[PDB]
Amino acid sequence: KYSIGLDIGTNSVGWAVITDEYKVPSKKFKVLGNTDRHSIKKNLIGALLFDSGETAEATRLKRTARRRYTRRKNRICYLQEIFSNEMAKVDDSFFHRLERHPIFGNIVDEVAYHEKYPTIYHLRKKLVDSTDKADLRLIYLALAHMIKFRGHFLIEGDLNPDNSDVDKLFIQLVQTYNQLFEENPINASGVDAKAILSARLSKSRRLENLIAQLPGEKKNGLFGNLIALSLGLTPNFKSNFDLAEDAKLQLSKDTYDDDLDNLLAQIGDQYADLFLAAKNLSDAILLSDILRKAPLSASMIKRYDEHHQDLTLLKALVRQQLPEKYKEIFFDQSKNGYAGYIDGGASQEEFYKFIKPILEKMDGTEELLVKLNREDLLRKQRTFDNGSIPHQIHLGELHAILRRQEDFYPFLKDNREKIEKILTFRPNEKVLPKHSLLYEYFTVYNELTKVLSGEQKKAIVDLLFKTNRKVTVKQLKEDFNASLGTYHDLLKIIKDKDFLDNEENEDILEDIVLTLTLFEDREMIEERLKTYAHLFDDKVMKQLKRRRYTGWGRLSRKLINGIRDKTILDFLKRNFMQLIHDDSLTFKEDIQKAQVSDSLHEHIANLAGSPAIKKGILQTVKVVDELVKVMGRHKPENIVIEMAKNSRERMKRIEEGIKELHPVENTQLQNEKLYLYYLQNGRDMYVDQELDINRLSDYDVDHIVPQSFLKDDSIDNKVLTRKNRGKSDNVPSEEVVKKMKNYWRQLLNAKLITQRKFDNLTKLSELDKAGFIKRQLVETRQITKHVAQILDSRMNTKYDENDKLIREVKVITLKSKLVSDFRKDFQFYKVREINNYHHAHDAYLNAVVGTALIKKYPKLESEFVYGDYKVYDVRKMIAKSEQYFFYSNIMNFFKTEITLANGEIRKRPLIETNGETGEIVWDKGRDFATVRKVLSMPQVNIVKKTEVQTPTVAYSVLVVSVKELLGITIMERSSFEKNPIDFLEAKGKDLIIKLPKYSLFELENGRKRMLASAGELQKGNELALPSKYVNFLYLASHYVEQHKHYLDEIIEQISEFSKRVILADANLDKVLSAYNKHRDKPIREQAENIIHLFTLTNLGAPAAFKYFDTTIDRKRYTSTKEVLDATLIHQSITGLYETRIDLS
């Protein structure tokens, strides 16, 4: 019955709820405060504002080595379960043995394994290529290595030749680069990237070679650095972005993702896709190499073999021609020779610089020198050249091995899909040995829990189970399956009852029995036992080795003794199962959570993005959850999501242009008309009659491919005209005018117009239109796709009997431009500064436009809705003039009237419907009115998220001889969470009243405060400005004039607001005084400055601002005494559920 709209930014999340006719519901919510307000009516439209500070959430959103470790561990734990019962037949202690440390339980097998498989890739390759049956352990090892280091998931489908095409991905890179720099694109022309990047030369040389194809681009240029990143090098991006500190990037470096995030935080998340493109390019360069069995494993083996051939050669040479240097090069390890390279800490570059001269002086062989130049001489296994691998390549080998060994092992046939799913997927402890002292003890105690008093139990163990290997019932009566069989074993060897009986040693002995169970070979057992040798007599040590155990229990050590409350072992010494199943006791609670004992945060943490955007993404999810529960747990039909020098570049272009063939400074060039005046050298694009400044700009401007086919408001599609002379009919600028073109082409050589613009100017097929539609609907930005996926996953959980996913909720991703342009055409104007309502209004508009679009064109669903849907043939939807659309602009149906380029007019029906389903999508009479009404209403839930920090106060608490506010350091809080009263008393009781940062209080004529600190307050109010004034300000700023009397009204409004809530008398007087002086100023200049005046009224920290010549310094609310008698308001994330406190 409803849909959700979402606007997502780095410090805000806008949200709206919408019905079938685009109305925003009103709802009554209960108010849980002690105040005599019990319900409140609120509209389901709002915005959540958040800071980017040090908090628990923030840490949870960062990558951590431990989370990764646990992830991998779990995957392997799942792998081993599939192998368990079958591995039990081959090698019962195999998975317990695994992390030189031995894989196998006997030395013969271990040594043989390492001799046959010097690297894991040898094993992989052999398992991929051999038809012979293989030991299960080997199979496991290969599979486990594949699953452990599965690679990346950047590529969506089963690998195809486009994925390894250097040319195409290079083109992609340039494309994404060009979209981010409209003014100075790079031309792919006919560059043979493939040949330059794939060629076998130095990285630097390949870079330098590639840039030779790009004229006017420097090596240290952004693009050059990106290429250098894709090639394998470590470029520095600080010079490119004017960063204060160093920003070096290397794809091969383990910290790269984090480093990239670090960069993105500074320069903006808008640049993520640009670097992702570079990474993709890198992958292609590597992929084409391994492709031109198991190609990866083979390449690694080749690397290994080359390495050893070269090593032997080099050694021989150095023995022959430079014996003095031999010991140095191959053994010293503190030098930069081969020894330092392998077992020292030496760079490939340090090593190379070290041996470069030695090889040249030697003259034995230059082949090696060539290899050195290529940086392919003595490669190590522990590298990939600026790379993490596509998981698909590991998947291939996985499949191959399984297919190879499935005939010999049926359980592999049966579980194949399962095993694949582990790699592709997107208690903790291992059981004690069966003959462990602790386990044996547990069994006897648990069996003996009943036949009995706690003291007697201990007596009975100490008496019968201890003195006798097996205790029987007759014997018991004189004074039982479970036996302390190991306790007794170890007595005869150790011959010391205390050593056992003392509990402090148990943690040592567990290791001894474990060691005995782990290995079937005296040598190994000895080696491990050597560590505990000092306690033990040498006659004992020899005896210990012969003892061997071959079993595994069902329970872990921590389960038996690790868990709290007494332990299981202690409660036992009731009944174990009953102990597990009692809610009164803590274990049950421990276990149940312990199995699970965060995934969403972890998932968001591994996206490529700043901390802020990640926080945003996190908040959205919570907002959605709450809105769903607000709407009675019914799920929404649709969710629409959107993610919320240049002047100086323009100059460079112009200056570059005139160099081929009066002056203005930069700041002005933002005027499209002036910038266009300069790009064109004051010449009319369309009539060969020169353009001079003051009039013709005002005359007109024109789109090259009109608005009706698509909206391209970029200068790449725009030109300054006389707009009838050039355009003629709607088709691109008419044939008769192309006789003008020589002009344009000169402007091409000058780089004054781009190639595409010229192609369009010289130029409409069905095919173009088809491209044009997809262009306007498909969001390229990766992060939005990830957000979409996350939302879709949370919303759609149920599967039907056919195991197909049930999609209750469609997650729609909207291009920003559609809503921006929707705002343009129908005059729903935005002014960011008056309040924060625009974030909410954006969300509302997103949902409106999105839902309208799916209702109108459901066949295009595949282009902007998450999930897999049929990709219809666009050509069928395009029509001849009379028969969705002949005119390609998708937003056209909103308009009552489409103006063609020639000026001719196409009229549309008042009500727009879907012909196929007959559904009503848009009613121009009612619906636009509703939109305005929705934007016009003054009650919008704006919530500033409360934050707890982790000399900084985590939060302030209200204390009650007197009422006072008290800050809490992070250091103080822990013991405070332990020992409240003694803190509170040491400093100087009903109420625990932690006031998180930004806590909201209200007082007087609806005047609220936010608690920044126990020392300062922030304004707590949103100034609701009537829409008329908003539109007037937008229109006044963007140069009718009969509406000059509204300025005074706006200022009167601001002043009313300020005197009511801001309470900045001295500041306001100056503000008001300033307006009196500058009535003379023109309207534009007049309007722009009243905008700045809004920072006086803005919600948040007080700040300073300049009105014309005058400057108003900020005022701080340094007294927190107001808050103490005020009414606190605890806000939900949506702000819909409130709790209102006021002791007074």
UniProtKB/Swiss-Prot annotation:
Effect annotated for changing residue 838 to A: Decreased DNA cleavage. In vivo, loss of Cas9-mediated CRISPR interference in plasmid transformation
According to the UniProt record, where is the region ARM? 53-70
Q: Which domain of life is it from?
A: Bacteria
Q: What is the effect of changing residue 842 to A?
A: Only cleaves 1 DNA strand, probably the noncomplementary strand. Processes guide RNAs correctly. In vivo, loss of Cas9-mediated CRISPR interference in plasmid transformation
- Identify the EC number(s): 3.1.-.-
User: Region annotation Recognition lobe: residue ranges?
Assistant: 53-598
**Cofactor entry:** Mg(2+)
Does Nuclease count among this protein's keywords? yes
Q: Does the keyword Transmembrane helix apply?
A: no
List its uses.
Coexpression of Cas9 with an artificial single guide RNA (sgRNA) which fuses the crRNA with the tracrRNA in human cells has shown it is possible to target and modify DNA sequences of interest. Cas9 plus the 2 sgRNAs have also been expressed individually in human and mouse cells to achieve DNA targeting; cleavage efficiencies of the artificial sgRNA were lower that those for systems with the 2 sgRNAs expressed separately. Microinjection of Cas9-encoding mRNA and a synthetic sgRNA into zebrafish embryos induces targeted mutations.
> HNH Cas9-type domain: which residues?
645-777
Chain intervals for the UniProt region annotation (PAM-interacting domain (PI)): 947-1144
Residue span of region RuvC-II: 598-644
Q: Which CDD domains match?
A: Csn1
Give residues annotated as binding Mn(2+) 3. 1078, 1109
Q: Briefly explain the null phenotype.
A: Loss of correct processing of pre-crRNA and tracrRNA. Loss of immunity against a plasmid with homology to CRISPR spacer sequences.
GO biological-process terms attached to the record: defense response to virus; maintenance of CRISPR repeat elements
Task: Report the activity regulation comment.
Answer: Only has nuclease activity when bound to both gRNAs (crRNA plus tracrRNA), which results in conformational changes in the protein and formation of a central channel which binds target DNA. Also requires interaction with PAM to trigger catalytic activity. Nuclease activity is inhibited by EDTA.
Q: Which residues bind Mn(2+) 1?
A: 7, 642
Q: Where, by residue number, is the motif PAM substrate-binding?
A: 1114-1116
Catalytic residues (UniProt): 7, 703
Region: RuvC-I; residue ranges are: 1-59
Q: Which InterPro entries match?
A: Cas9, Cas9-BH, Cas9_PI, Cas9_REC, Cas9_RuvC, HNH_CAS9, HNH_nuc, RNaseH_sf
Which residues, if any, are the signal sequence? none
> Quaternary structure per UniProt?
Monomer. Binds crRNA and tracrRNA.
What name has this protein been given in UniProt? Answer: CRISPR-associated endonuclease Cas9/Csn1
Q: Which gene encodes it?
A: cas9
